Amino acid sequence: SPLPLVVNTWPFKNATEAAWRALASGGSALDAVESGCAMCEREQCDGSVGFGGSPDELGETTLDAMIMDGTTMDVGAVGDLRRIKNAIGVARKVLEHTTHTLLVGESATTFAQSMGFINEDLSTSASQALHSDWLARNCQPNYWRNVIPDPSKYCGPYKPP
Amino acid sequence: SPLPLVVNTWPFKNATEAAWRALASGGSALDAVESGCAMCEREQCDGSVGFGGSPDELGETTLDAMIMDGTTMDVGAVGDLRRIKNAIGVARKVLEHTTHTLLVGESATTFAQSMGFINEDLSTSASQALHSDWLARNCQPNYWRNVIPDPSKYCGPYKPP
Amino acid sequence: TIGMVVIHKTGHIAAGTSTNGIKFKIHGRVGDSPIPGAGAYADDTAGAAAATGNGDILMRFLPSYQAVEYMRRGEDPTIACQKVISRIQKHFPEFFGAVICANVTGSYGAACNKLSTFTQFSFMVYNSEKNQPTEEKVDCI
Amino acid sequence: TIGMVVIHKTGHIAAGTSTNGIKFKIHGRVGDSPIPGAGAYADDTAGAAAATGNGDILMRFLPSYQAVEYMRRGEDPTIACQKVISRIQKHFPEFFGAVICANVTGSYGAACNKLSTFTQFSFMVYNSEKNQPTEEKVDCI
Numbered sequence: 015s016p017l018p019l020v021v022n023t024w025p026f027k028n029a030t031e032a033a034w035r036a037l038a039s040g041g042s043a044l045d046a047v048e049s050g051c052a053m054c055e056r057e058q059c060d061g062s063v064g065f066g067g068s069p070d071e072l073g074e075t076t077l078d079a080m081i082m083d084g085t086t087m088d089v090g091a092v093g094d095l096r097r098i099k100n101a102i103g104v105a106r107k108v109l110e111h112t113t114h115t116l117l118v119g120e121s122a123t124t125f126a127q128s129m130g131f132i133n134e135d136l137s138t139s140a141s142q143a144l145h146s147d148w149l150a151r152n153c154q155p156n157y158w159r160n161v162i163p164d165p166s167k168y169c170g171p172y173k174p175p
Numbered sequence: 176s177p178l179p180l181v182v183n184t185w186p187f188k189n190a191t192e193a194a195w196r197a198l199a200s201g202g203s204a205l206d207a208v209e210s211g212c213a214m215c216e217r218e219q220c221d222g223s224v225g226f227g228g229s230p231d232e233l234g235e236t237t238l239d240a241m242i243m244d245g246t247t248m249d250v251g252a253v254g255d256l257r258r259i260k261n262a263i264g265v266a267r268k269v270l271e272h273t274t275h276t277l278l279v280g281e282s283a284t285t286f287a288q289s290m291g292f293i294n295e296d297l298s299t300s301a302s303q304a305l306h307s308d309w310l311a312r313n314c315q316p317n318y319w320r321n322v323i324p325d326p327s328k329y330c331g332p333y334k335p336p
Numbered sequence: 337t338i339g340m341v342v343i344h345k346t347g348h349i350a351a352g353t354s355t356n357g358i359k360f361k362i363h364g365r366v367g368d369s370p371i372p373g374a375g376a377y378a379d380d381t382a383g384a385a386a387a388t389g390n391g392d393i394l395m396r397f398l399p400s401y402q403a404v405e406y407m408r409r410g411e412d413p414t415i416a417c418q419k420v421i422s423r424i425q426k427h428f429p430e431f432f433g434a435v436i437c438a439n440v441t442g443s444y445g446a447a448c449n450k451l452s453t454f455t456q457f458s459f460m461v462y463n464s465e466k467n468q469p470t471e472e473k474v475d476c477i
Numbered sequence: 478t479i480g481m482v483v484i485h486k487t488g489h490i491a492a493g494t495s496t497n498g499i500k501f502k503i504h505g506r507v508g509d510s511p512i513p514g515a516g517a518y519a520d521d522t523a524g525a526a527a528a529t530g531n532g533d534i535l536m537r538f539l540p541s542y543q544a545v546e547y548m549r550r551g552e553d554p555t556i557a558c559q560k561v562i563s564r565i566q567k568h569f570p571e572f573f574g575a576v577i578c579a580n581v582t583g584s585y586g587a588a589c590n591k592l593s594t595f596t597q598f599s600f601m602v603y604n605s606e607k608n609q610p611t612e613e614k615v616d617c618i
């Protein structure tokens with residue numbers, strides 16, 4: 015019943031308030047959603063948001079992020095954003111500057127760069143430290159199935175049976 | 176009302192034919208759907224499916240495909256699949272060799288090579304020209320907005336004012 | 337785009353799509369096609385659907401998921417499809433889009449948006465009823 | 478992932494997420510987070526919802542979209558979110574997933590599948606009455 019309102023997943027207070035401040039200055043809901051989410055990018059909230067965490071099998075960090083305009087029902091989305099930190103920032107740019115919904119990969123990097131986003135490695139010593147111990151644990155866990163060598167015991171490159 | 180049933184978008188007789196033949200041979204819905212769509216990739220149905228059609232702004236064709244099992248409700252999908260012609264073939268693999276749902280871009284190409292897909296150019300003199308005519312017309316139409324130079328009149332590189 | 341729906345003799349359903357996208361797309365653009373619930377959706381306990389058209393617009397309303405969701409609620413395949421077109425229609429009266437629908441028992445149907453340049457949607461149906469595929473056309477709404 | 482839902486005073490809604498995926502994902506993997514209707518969805522005529530958890534399973538059930546459809550009937554947020562979790566629960570008894578819902582009036586709620594390693598979900602809240610961001614919690618079902 016009492017408006018405005020902000021609700022985020024997990025105990026990320028710094029983000030909740032970064033969103034409220036956005037509303038405080040009479041910012042749009044969209045503005046508030048970008049500020050809160052992006053705040054967790056800097057803080058790498060629980061290592062589940064932002065760079066320097068959750069490395070793929072090759073050790074790289076790739077970011078997904080979206081924002082939805084509830085009024086027009088317009089979406090700005092990035093999937094597999096490579097070498098760009100402000101993921102949701104790039105997402106607002108797809109909403110605001112293209113008639114599209116989702117752009118992905120190294121292609122979304124080139125779009126981000128035009129939008130003025132700084133291309134930079136998303137790796138940290140920590141992100142890699144995580145990658146090496148994994149390699150040492152025989153890539154367990156992983157997401158393959160029905161491939162040789164056995165996915166539950168060995169690291170790839172795998173081939174279909 | 177009697178089964179089996181194959182329904183597909185557009186008057187693409189051959190795809191319908193290809194899928195029905197799968198089922199006849201003892202194939203499953205999955206094999207049927209893969210045969211139908213794989214057929215429209217070879218034939219380039221309307222140039223809206225498969226290689227050598229709908230080039231992006233840089234003239235490259237990129238394929239989107241997906242397969243979904245209604246039993247397990249598992250999905251295999253590819254987006255921005257680069258340099259691989261059998262899109263639906265690669266999607267079927269993501270469904271059977273991974274616990275993931277969507278693999279995109281040049282990263283998805285690697286995957287397809289690992290699965291045994293021939294890495295090749297999806298361009299054709301037809302799409303190559305379809306793109307030059309487009310550029311000569313000052314890139315009309317395009318999907319940009321709120322940028323300079325004016326998208327309604329000039330080609331890129333674009334940028335926020 | 338080719339959107340396909342298939343119900344095995346044993347009652348199992350599958351849905352899929354394969355496309356090269358929309359013409360002159362921005363480099364790196366992914367539309368509604370490979371997206372579960374947008375381009376296609378299959379559910380053995382309800383049915384299946386598949387859309388085709390302006391994916392940018394389509395994707396945001398999950399046409400296939402809602403077509404199955406209605407058929408799950410117990411609705412005529414055609415009426416499930418037409419409702420889905422009507423909802424997007426209200427938000428984008430000139431959007432290009434078409435959907436095919438089919439319930440677990442083999443009944444099917446489709447619907448599309450009526451535009452100055454698209455009043456009929458042709459789609460292929462191959463069934464035991466007619467051992468030969470036959471093109472069908474539904475007037476747009 | 479940080480799923481975030483915002484309802485301005487004007488009554489306009491927004492939603493969004495940002496993530497780095499799940500650890501050791503295959504090169505190029507993209508989950509539910511960036512997918513409208515799955516990772517998050519928002520509509521001014523009904524409400525919004527965001528999701529967090531295993532994107533590979535969630536993405537196929539479009540939790541955020543369905544949560545909003547329930548609320549579009551007038552379902553209470555806690556229940557729309559709870560019903561969604563249950564639909565998935567049938568198919569994958571052990572799925573990791575949590576969703577936050579909020580209708581057009583400012584009513585919120587959340588729900589989560591109960592695993593022996595995930596029994597309670599904490600989410601932040603910020604509205605007038607309290608002011609100061611408050612940390613909510615719900616017991617998983």
Ligand SMILES: *[C@@H]1O[C@H](CO)[C@@H](O[C@@H]2O[C@H](CO)[C@@H](O[C@@H]3O[C@H](CO)[C@@H](O)[C@H](O)[C@@H]3O)[C@H](O)[C@H]2NC(C)=O)[C@H](O)[C@H]1NC(C)=O
Nearest residue numbers: 176382407408410411412413414438439440441442443444
């Ligand atoms: C899949 O879709 C078809 C088409 O909407 C459904 O078929 C229809 O089924 C209804 C319910 O069985 C039949 O109508 C009933 O007719 C009887 C006549 O005895 C009457 O007692 C009822 O008051 C009502 O009028 C209808 O004839 C039939 N139509 C066709 C074209 O087959 C089917 O049930 C759907 N399947 C599922 C599993 O939802």
Ligand SMILES: *[C@@H]1O[C@H](CO)[C@@H](O)[C@H](O)[C@H]1NC(C)=O
Nearest residue numbers: 026027028029057058059060
């Ligand atoms: C915000 O949260 C992070 C996450 O633990 C914490 O370390 C930091 O002190 C907080 N920053 C501020 C300004 O309160």
Ligand SMILES: *[C@@H]1O[C@H](CO)[C@@H](O)[C@H](O)[C@H]1NC(C)=O
Nearest residue numbers: 186187188189190218219220
């Ligand atoms: C389907 O049939 C022929 C048979 O080989 C094929 O060339 C083409 O893809 C389709 N032909 C027409 C006229 O649609």
Ligand SMILES: *[C@@H]1O[C@H](CO)[C@@H](O)[C@H](O)[C@H]1NC(C)=O
Nearest residue numbers: 551552553554580581582584
């Ligand atoms: C929001 O939630 C409460 C509890 O269900 C309900 O009374 C209220 O009317 C809901 N808002 C709308 C618009 O239905």
Ligand SMILES: N[C@@H](CC(=O)O)C(=O)O
Nearest residue numbers: 337357358367388389391
């Ligand atoms: N759905 C396709 C277009 C089409 O169906 O022709 C896309 O937007 O990628």
Ligand SMILES: N[C@@H](CC(=O)O)C(=O)O
Nearest residue numbers: 478498508529530531532
């Ligand atoms: N849903 C995210 C992970 C999470 O939210 O915990 C993903 O799988 O991409």
